[PDB]
Design a protein around this ligand. Sequence first.
Ligand SMILES: *[C@@H]1O[C@H](CO[C@@H]2O[C@@H](C)[C@@H](O)[C@@H](O)[C@@H]2O)[C@@H](O[C@@H]2O[C@H](CO)[C@@H](O[C@@H]3O[C@H](CO[C@H]4O[C@H](CO)[C@@H](O)[C@H](O)[C@@H]4O[C@@H]4O[C@H](CO)[C@@H](O)[C@H](O)[C@H]4NC(C)=O)[C@@H](O)[C@H](O[C@H]4O[C@H](CO)[C@@H](O)[C@H](O)[C@@H]4O[C@@H]4O[C@H](CO)[C@@H](O)[C@H](O)[C@H]4NC(C)=O)[C@@H]3O)[C@H](O)[C@H]2NC(C)=O)[C@H](O)[C@H]1NC(C)=O
Ligand SMILES: *[C@H]1O[C@H](CO[C@@H]2O[C@@H](C)[C@@H](O)[C@@H](O)[C@@H]2O)[C@@H](O[C@@H]2O[C@H](CO)[C@@H](O[C@@H]3O[C@H](CO[C@H]4O[C@H](CO)[C@@H](O)[C@H](O)[C@@H]4O[C@@H]4O[C@H](CO)[C@@H](O)[C@H](O)[C@H]4NC(C)=O)[C@@H](O)[C@H](O[C@H]4O[C@H](CO)[C@@H](O)[C@H](O)[C@@H]4O[C@@H]4O[C@H](CO)[C@@H](O)[C@H](O)[C@H]4NC(C)=O)[C@@H]3O)[C@H](O)[C@H]2NC(C)=O)[C@H](O)[C@H]1NC(C)=O
Lengths: 207, 208
Amino acid sequence: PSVFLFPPKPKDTLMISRTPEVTCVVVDVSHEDPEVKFNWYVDGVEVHNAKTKPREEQYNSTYRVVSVLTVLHQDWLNGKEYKCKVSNKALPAPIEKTISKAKGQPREPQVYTLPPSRDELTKNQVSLTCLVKGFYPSDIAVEWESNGQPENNYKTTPPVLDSDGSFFLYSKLTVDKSRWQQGNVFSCSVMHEALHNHYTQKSLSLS
Amino acid sequence: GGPSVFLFPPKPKDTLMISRTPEVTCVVVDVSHEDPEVKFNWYVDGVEVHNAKTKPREEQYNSTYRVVSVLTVLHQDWLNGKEYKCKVSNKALPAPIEKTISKAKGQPREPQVYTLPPSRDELTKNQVSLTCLVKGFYPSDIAVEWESNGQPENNYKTTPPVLDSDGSFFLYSKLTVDKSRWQQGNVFSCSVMHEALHNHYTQKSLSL
Ligand SMILES: *[C@@H]1O[C@H](CO[C@@H]2O[C@@H](C)[C@@H](O)[C@@H](O)[C@@H]2O)[C@@H](O[C@@H]2O[C@H](CO)[C@@H](O[C@@H]3O[C@H](CO[C@H]4O[C@H](CO)[C@@H](O)[C@H](O)[C@@H]4O[C@@H]4O[C@H](CO)[C@@H](O)[C@H](O)[C@H]4NC(C)=O)[C@@H](O)[C@H](O[C@H]4O[C@H](CO)[C@@H](O)[C@H](O)[C@@H]4O[C@@H]4O[C@H](CO)[C@@H](O)[C@H](O)[C@H]4NC(C)=O)[C@@H]3O)[C@H](O)[C@H]2NC(C)=O)[C@H](O)[C@H]1NC(C)=O
Ligand SMILES: *[C@H]1O[C@H](CO[C@@H]2O[C@@H](C)[C@@H](O)[C@@H](O)[C@@H]2O)[C@@H](O[C@@H]2O[C@H](CO)[C@@H](O[C@@H]3O[C@H](CO[C@H]4O[C@H](CO)[C@@H](O)[C@H](O)[C@@H]4O[C@@H]4O[C@H](CO)[C@@H](O)[C@H](O)[C@H]4NC(C)=O)[C@@H](O)[C@H](O[C@H]4O[C@H](CO)[C@@H](O)[C@H](O)[C@@H]4O[C@@H]4O[C@H](CO)[C@@H](O)[C@H](O)[C@H]4NC(C)=O)[C@@H]3O)[C@H](O)[C@H]2NC(C)=O)[C@H](O)[C@H]1NC(C)=O
């Protein structure tokens, strides 16, 4: 069997109303010796407020078991390490893995929206672009909207490391050209720790 | 935990330009001293082939052997979706390991290439962002380069291909230039290479 430790989702750590969670995911657990334990430490100290989830069988004979610790927003955002221990009869010894947020001074994203290229405007569907650059660390969340209604048809590139050590990404929202034509306003929402109130938005309209 | 095998495909650019030499590479690692002998077999669509070039093994600093075999592939063969199988045998193995690689299956689709000038809010800053949007391509193997006046740029970074809901791929490439150049009115050029482009090339320019 193996181990894989994972961080909160960015959106989760940035809005106080949401519940950010770290999660140990153990793979290639077998029927024989099926009992898997966990233990959790935050900055090494044992913490007890965690919750192992009930298990699941995989096709390939082997299980996929998963524990979950809830986390404080400021704790994660201040670099505390989240260590997860895992035990099992088919071990050499107790596995262990660790995670924490990237080190470094947070850097604020600059957010630009770009209209469709002339060349694409004539087509049935046009592409609205949102360029987010200069941000550190790479934990970020992007969303689109019009009229305070969530647009659903957009995709966002992963963050890419730029030449100066910050990250950028693009988000592409595709809309039927008419909406673009009618003059509707579209907005790109960006969530990031270095932003005032973890959040900014930029609008895109036909001029 | 015996030998492990990794099979790497050609670089996209190499399969698209007849001048270059696309290769598939079968890398074996963690080969022991106990059994250091390694045998490669190569198959192109199930049919065994014999022109592969296998380098002599190399001890790594962790006292395991690394062995590499290189199969030169024909461009039209890779682009016609032939499958390349590497087969690795070692006396430490319960059975031989086999890995297979090919161009991703599906129908190719031509990229649409679009260049976007700097946002107004950014035309101010000392340095400015030229964007090349490449959309609607399949499969995701692609190459993007920026040029001005025949010379390559360098200050550019490109996203990985992203899956776009209609099944095709898109990506953005970002060229960064000093504000002066952009206002001085130099044409900057975004080259794309892809199997589904005529001549496997297109190029769009960007200026003020
Ligand atoms: C003893 O030492 C050797 C040598 O190691 C080297 O030196 C030591 C001292 C250390 O410093 C090492 O860090 C250093 O690498 C060890 O050999 C290594 O063995 C590991 C596995 O244990 C290999 O990992 C794999 O790497 C490939 C990527 O490999 C390219 O990139 C590396 C740099 O990032 C580079 O070093 C490699 O040489 C290689 O470079 C490429 O070479 C080709 C051929 O020449 C060339 O054309 C390319 O241009 C070039 N690319 C460059 C420069 O970037 C990685 O892809 C593998 O990931 C797959 O498999 C994993 C399983 O191990 C899995 O977790 C991953 O998710 C991934 O899974 C696969 O993913 C594909 C698609 O993503 C998917 O289709 C499959 O489903 C899936 N396959 C599965 C599940 O198997 C993997 O991480 C190292 O490459 C290798 N190093 C070298 C130089 O060969 C050895 O392990 C040591 N042993 C010990 C500790 O005892
Ligand atoms: C039999 O099947 C099982 C189950 O597989 C599944 O079912 C079968 C039947 C098939 O259909 C499969 O295709 C199918 O997926 C296999 O179990 C898989 O086992 C592998 C290990 O062999 C595990 O590998 C790893 O995956 C993680 C990422 O997994 C997160 O992302 C996955 C997609 O990428 C996703 O599937 C997971 O669910 C999980 O996702 C997330 O879930 C969390 C928690 O719920 C959630 O909060 C997240 O939001 C969500 N994320 C997303 C995107 O949805 C990957 O991280 C592991 O990677 C590293 O490890 C490699 C070595 O294992 C190494 O080569 C890589 O380079 C990389 O190494 C790390 O690199 C970083 C940076 O460079 C470095 O900092 C780290 O130190 C380094 N790590 C270290 C220390 O090694 C790894 O690839 C799969 O998770 C697991 N799949 C599932 C679904 O459980 C099993 O292997 C099969 N068995 C056999 C014999 O074949």
